[PDB]
Amino acid sequence: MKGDKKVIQHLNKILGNELIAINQYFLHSRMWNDWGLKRLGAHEYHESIDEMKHADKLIERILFLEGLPNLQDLGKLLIGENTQEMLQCDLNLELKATKDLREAIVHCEQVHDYVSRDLLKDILESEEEHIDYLETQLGLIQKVGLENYLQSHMHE
Amino acid sequence: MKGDKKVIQHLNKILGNELIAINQYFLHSRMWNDWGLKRLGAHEYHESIDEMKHADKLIERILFLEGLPNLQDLGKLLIGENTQEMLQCDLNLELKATKDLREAIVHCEQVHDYVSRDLLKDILESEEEHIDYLETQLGLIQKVGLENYLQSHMHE
Amino acid sequence: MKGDKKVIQHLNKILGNELIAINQYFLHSRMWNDWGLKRLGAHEYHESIDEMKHADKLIERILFLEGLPNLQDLGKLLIGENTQEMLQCDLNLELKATKDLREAIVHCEQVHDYVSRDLLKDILESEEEHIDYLETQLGLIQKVGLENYLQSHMHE
Amino acid sequence: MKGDKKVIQHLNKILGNELIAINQYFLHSRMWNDWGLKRLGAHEYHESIDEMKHADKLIERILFLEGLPNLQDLGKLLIGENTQEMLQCDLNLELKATKDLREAIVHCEQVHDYVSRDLLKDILESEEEHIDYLETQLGLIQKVGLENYLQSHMHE
Amino acid sequence: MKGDKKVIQHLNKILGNELIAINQYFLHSRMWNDWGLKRLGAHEYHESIDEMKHADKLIERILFLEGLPNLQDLGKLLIGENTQEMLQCDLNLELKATKDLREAIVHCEQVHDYVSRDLLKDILESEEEHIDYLETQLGLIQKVGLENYLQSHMHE
Amino acid sequence: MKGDKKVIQHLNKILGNELIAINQYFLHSRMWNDWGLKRLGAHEYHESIDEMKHADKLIERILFLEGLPNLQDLGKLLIGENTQEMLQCDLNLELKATKDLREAIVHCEQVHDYVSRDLLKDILESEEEHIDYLETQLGLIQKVGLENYLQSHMHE
Amino acid sequence: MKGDKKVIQHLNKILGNELIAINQYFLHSRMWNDWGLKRLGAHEYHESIDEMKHADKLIERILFLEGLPNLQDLGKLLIGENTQEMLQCDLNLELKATKDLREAIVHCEQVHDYVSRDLLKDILESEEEHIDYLETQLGLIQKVGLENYLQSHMHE
Ligand code: HEM
Ligand code: HEM
Ligand code: HEM
Ligand code: HEM
Numbered sequence A, B, C, D, E, F, G: 001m002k003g004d005k006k007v008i009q010h011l012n013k014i015l016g017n018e019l020i021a022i023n024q025y026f027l028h029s030r031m032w033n034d035w036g037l038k039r040l041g042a043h044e045y046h047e048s049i050d051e052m053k054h055a056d057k058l059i060e061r062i063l064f065l066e067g068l069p070n071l072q073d074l075g076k077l078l079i080g081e082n083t084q085e086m087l088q089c090d091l092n093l094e095l096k097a098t099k100d101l102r103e104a105i106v107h108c109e110q111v112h113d114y115v116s117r118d119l120l121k122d123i124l125e126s127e128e129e130h131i132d133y134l135e136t137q138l139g140l141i142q143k144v145g146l147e148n149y150l151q152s153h154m155h156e
């Protein structure tokens, strides 16, 4: 079904953000696992999987709309060097992701692509839930102290 | 455990090949699904998952050896425009992957990193299994005809 | 709960499209079954049942909004004479149906009938899935040949 | 129990034919699997297993009759280069085998070795069933065409 | 996948050793069963089956590497005339097999056919397990006496 | 089966290292249990058992190769007196152990004892898993602080 | 709980005896397994395990009493070269062990370490059970002859 060219451009932009997130979260997961912070590693692994599922749906939607999914262009991964930085890197990424999702939803609405809008809204709900998690972790580091926070994330 | 710097470079190079293949096979899978060739789409999805698992193991090995996994530098995806082309693109990628695997194994052997060698040998066994599958599909297209071959791959 | 009069008019227009689709898809189903193409016959039956469920929900919404559902005025059935024509007739109907659905959503949004919009978005998702199915069938006819395509739809 | 010398010679000749068939069918099975014709590959594997079981019983009978089973002399394997040739190679071998079985049964009857006769009759029944299969496959190649015939033997 | 021509020659040489062992061990098994030494007969049967499985894997590897498996050129079976000779004939055969396996692995390693090497290594582990069994049996014949050793192998 | 004399000397050297590790880990386990650090105690017990299993396989291999396993010449145990030193003592022992394993594998490869090499490779994989655990634990003490680290290991 | 210094020295002497017995019984077990005498191998393995469990209770008691368990000094292993010698070597060790256990119990009684006495009495009961087994095996060899005795210990 021939989709709107600019919708497909927006879907490829969102897809690009998801492809960054997949790799960034997966590396952060395996870094936390390497450091013995297995609760963080497991949670971050599930974040990466969730972004994979979003990327899948975007690819499927782009192809149904007769566009070409772009899995070639990979933007800048924000890789931290310690737990505080890694969480903030994920948070910085997610805030760019939600800006772009809101702009894509506007455009879907204007060309009456209400199904693509509904998909993007679902992805946006998932990204805001990730923001909630991240902001909460950063707040907990302040409330319990960094050593306690990390200790609490050693064991699953 | 401090690894050989050149081993780590080889492992990042293999990881780079797996990252290409993850994206190429995943896109090929969703294209075949979109065209109604669901048996191909499902098979190619499982190939993409297999590459994801190899990438995971490579990432974990690099970190254990105190290297920096490189998920940033994505190489060229070989995307076909029809089934015959897509299969040949996968095969071309696999032949490059196995050449690089052999060179990495040689080096691991020379520096006595026998555990990295064992990992890469397992990955090489998986890639040769993919080559077998790909060569066989191309052969079947010649034996049964393209139209029959595609017909046989419509339904799961 | 007294609804917007033009919303009710749009809902009755969507219902009119669903009532055409029920009969067209049911007759095509039974034609394919009579011809021994039982996989087409069964899939088309399920498409007709889906339209019946949509019509049900539209009738219920119209009555809740204190309008009069119009089940009396049946528009033109597009009945094919062979498989390719029947599929294209279904696709022509669906493209008209999605056009009307989008115009109805616009009007729901403008007068703040957000629940009617949500119902119509869900129906639109179902109709786009049928379009995907129909487009894929027509494409498969070109990839495997009509004779193979019909062969693959003889048996459930 | 001391058997007739010529009966034992016949049994060793039948054994020699089965030993050829084991290897021929096993190699054909693995050729078909390598080509992705897994249904032919699996069926031919079962034909090879059936010949293994006959060879076992012949070896046991020879040893009971105080003869020396000959597993050393292996006659000529008829290996085809395509599916039609492999099937005909199997058939030609089976037609020789049943001729030799009939001559061995004649001699068993003459010297009153009714138990060896019964064994050979059971083996002959298996070989005629294999002939039925082979002639049927070659007939189906003619009825449905080679491309369809091979298509129908891709998947188990 | 086109393999190294000398690798393929080594694989056919290993395959030829497996084919001798299949026949030698099967015949020894059935001789022991005929003599009422059913525990030896059963264990020897399972040795033959294991060699059949190795032969299968070699045939498959050879075909994947685009060589022609040789099931035609059967070398010399070493058939004993009593239990002590049969075991020693098996051991003599296994010691030649392991020599040939080691030389094949050397070459696989030199030309980087690491998957063929892995297969050969697995086969060599099975062959060394058989050597262990055979050497132990000959030691037991000394330690318990021939009469007791045979008595211990009458019943399963 | 007569083994290479120097291979057997390497195997006895690896055995000696496992024999040290069995006792060191078992004592460290029981010290941690006595101190109320039961999670360390249990994990360290499982490390000792794994070393026991490696020593068993080494003894079995040495005897098969017709060597004399040396369980008499116990080398120096590295017994720590607090948690951090105990972990570092285990790490120091493992680093010596993997150095010896690599030298033994080199020699196995040179004399073509590929089964001994495969055994030592499996043992090296286990010791590298232990190194990974140990390095992770020492890193955790730095990240969460010694008092929290110990706290987290009081309870199973 | 600070224990009597000479009690602790006795406990370490008993521990030393158990440590010799662990290795001596484990090697004898694996020697019998290598020779095909698996019932002897299995029983001697279970004797080695029993001594391992005694050593564990002695290590735990010494630590509780605030002594230092000595796992470093290994006394002389009495390794036999044939079954009779191996059993007698085990018996000679056990008789030295029970002599040392009796002197240890005398001293525990004198200084009122009744709990250590109870542990040593339990170990003494196990060692006297092992002496029973060993004396009985040596007696059976005399009654049934070594060849029959070994025959009866081939299969588990
Ligand atoms: C560095 C790149 C990637 C890595 C390391 C990775 C890793 C993984 C792993 C380990 C799994 C679990 C496999 C299993 O055990 O079953 C998985 C699942 C999955 N991946 Fe990826 N992946 C990557 C990229 C992608 C991309 C780019 C996509 C899609 C565009 C994707 C789509 C999926 C899906 C759909 C699943 C299954 C999720 C489910 O459980 O439903 N992955 N991935
Ligand atoms: C040509 C006109 C129609 C035909 C031939 C037809 C046929 C059928 C058939 C054969 C079934 C399955 C019943 C069963 O076996 O249990 C069914 C179910 C149903 N029909 Fe129709 N129908 C028609 C029109 C309609 C209309 C106009 C509506 C609503 C406005 C409707 C609503 C439904 C509903 C709600 C179901 C139950 C579906 C479910 O939940 O499984 N049908 N119809
Ligand atoms: C090229 C030579 C041969 C090959 C590749 C081969 C291969 C095989 C394989 C793969 C199996 C199934 C094993 C399993 O997974 O359980 C099998 C079974 C068997 N083979 Fe062979 N074989 C060969 C020769 C022989 C010969 C020469 C004999 C007898 C003289 C024989 C007797 C049997 C028997 C009795 C079975 C078990 C059948 C059953 O399931 O009852 N085979 N063979
Ligand atoms: C030559 C040195 C040793 C060898 C080869 C050895 C071997 C073994 C083996 C093979 C097992 C069974 C493991 C399994 O499959 O789960 C085991 C268990 C065990 N070992 Fe050792 N071991 C040795 C020394 C020791 C020592 C020195 C101690 C204590 C100081 C010890 C304490 C234990 C314990 C407590 C068990 C568990 C027994 C049970 O409850 O089942 N072992 N050993």
Ligand SMILES: [K+]
Binding pocket: A148, A151, F148, F151
């Ligand atoms: K705390």
Ligand SMILES: [K+]
Binding pocket: E148, E151, G148, G151
């Ligand atoms: K006896």
